[PDB]
Ligand binder design. Structure first.
Ligand SMILES: Nc1nc2[nH]nc(CC(=O)O)c(=O)c2c(=O)[nH]1
Ligand SMILES: Nc1nc2[nH]nc(CC(=O)O)c(=O)c2c(=O)[nH]1
Lengths: 262, 262
């Protein structure tokens, strides 16, 4: 049981009543546009609103200048038209600042504050919850889980040293990153181990490659496989699940929650 | 790891390589017919064949005379046109004899050999695998799991005393029987406990009521909820899952199997 809530500015996410669903926003860049066109932002608001209606609790919105021209226009519209906390999917320090300014409540660094250490400071400054996902430029592990926890801890070191509060820290195993198909199945089977570090954990496996490797199905045929990873993750104690199929995953999460007793 | 295979006459089911999917056959009685009409049996063969193509490993086919007039005609067609072991879903001794005669390889007693003790003898005789599901005429438990295991053991007593071989015994928790919505969620959260009795376990929760009670959805909207129960069950060590949505549940079972390492 957590003795605190995830404080996200206007909104507050409770980590005990249920598994929090983070829906991946569908960004489809408009040609002839640096970012901001009616088509792009509108299609984005329709999705945000849609996911919001089918169970989402968070909306994850994903050069350095281009990235800002594209993401800012959406964080502005979505935050205004959809009453839900927004997280910015990036590792770059600048993009993270801009995004929180436009309205983003959470940071989502796929490189755990290691590719641009300054982003940890951006997070500490604005005092927003940050997601440190496991990642590395190689897949040569002595002991997968042992090294994952070691790498994660080093992201936590960079985060805390930057002034990040323990309560504004969330971990992610990094399923699908610097891991072979078999190594991903190993992380899944051992996810509970991350819990020893004492922080909430977010699981991102939606429609990923290792599900295709196992079921041998294309990307648009990985719904039942995503579900399985989600159920096993909730059962191993995950607080959040980052998915595409918000409607389907919400029911599975909810039914899971009832059974485990969350 | 099991040190033996489920011997079903012509076919042999291995309990270690994967979770065995038992598909529920769609029996829709034909009016003006005691049983056997072309419509009934044909529609039944189409389903059996369909499930067979989407992952099933077993086909479960469900007065005393009527029951025989209806079930025998199908076990005959299905067994002949579909190369897969067939199980007869009944508790009555006579129906069980007839069914195995027509071609049924497994018995599926929803009353664990307690409503008609003679069925255990039918099973011992023909030497076929039998499924003892938990059930009772009341829901007044002192300790749910403790009493479930106690009741199950009494079905095992009736079975073994009848001459049934330990290797031809399969247990089922009886989700949805003599259990309140909350009690079903309790059985699910504690399923691993059944494993202490030393027998393979079959889980039947497909589209059941407690999933509607939790998700608050009608029967045709319980696919994501069935999946969750299936994934948690496989994770708690189930060898078989009795489902309606064979295509969907097979992928989830398969992905589960990869992750847990079955
Ligand atoms: N925290 C987190 N962020 C991500 N951002 N982008 C991706 C790329 C993607 O959508 O496949 C991802 O997988 C994850 C993840 O698993 N976890
Ligand atoms: N073994 C077993 N047999 C059944 N037969 N019929 C039913 C009725 C049904 O299809 O809902 C059932 O739930 C089960 C079960 O859970 N388990």
């Amino acid at each position: 049981k957590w003795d605190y809530d995830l404080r996200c500015g206007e909104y507050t996410l409770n980590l005990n009543e249920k598994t929090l669903i983070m829906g991946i926003l569908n960004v489809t860049p408009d040609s002839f546009s640096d970012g901001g066109s009616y088509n792009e932002v509108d299609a984005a608001v329709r999705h945000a609103k849609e996911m919001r209606d089918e169970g989402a609790h968070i909306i994850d919105i994903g050069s350095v200048e281009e990235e800002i021209k594209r993401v800012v226009p959406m964080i502005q519209a979505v935050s205004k038209e959809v009453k839900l906390p927004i997280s910015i999917d990036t590792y770059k320090a600048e993009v993270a600042k801009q995004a929180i300014e436009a309205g983003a409540h959470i940071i989502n660094d796929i490189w755990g504050a290691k590719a641009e250490p300054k982003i940890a400071e951006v997070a500490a400054h604005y005092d927003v919850p940050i997601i440190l996902m496991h990642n590395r430029d190689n897949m040569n592990y002595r002991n997968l889980m042992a090294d994952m926890i070691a790498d994660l801890y080093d992201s936590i070191k960079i985060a805390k040293d930057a002034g990040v509060r323990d309560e504004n820290i969330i971990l992610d195993p990094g399923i699908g990153f610097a891991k072979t198909p078999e190594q991903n199945l190993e992380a899944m089977r051992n996810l509970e181990q991350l819990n020893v570090l004492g922080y909430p954990v977010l699981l991102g496996t939606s429609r990923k490659s290792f599900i295709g490797h196992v079921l041998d199905l294309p990307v648009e045929e990985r719904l039942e496989g995503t579900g399985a990873t989600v159920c096993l993750g909730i059962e191993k104690g995950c607080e959040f699940v980052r998915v595409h199929d918000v409607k389907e995953m919400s029911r599975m999460a909810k039914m899971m929650d009832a059974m485990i007793g969350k």
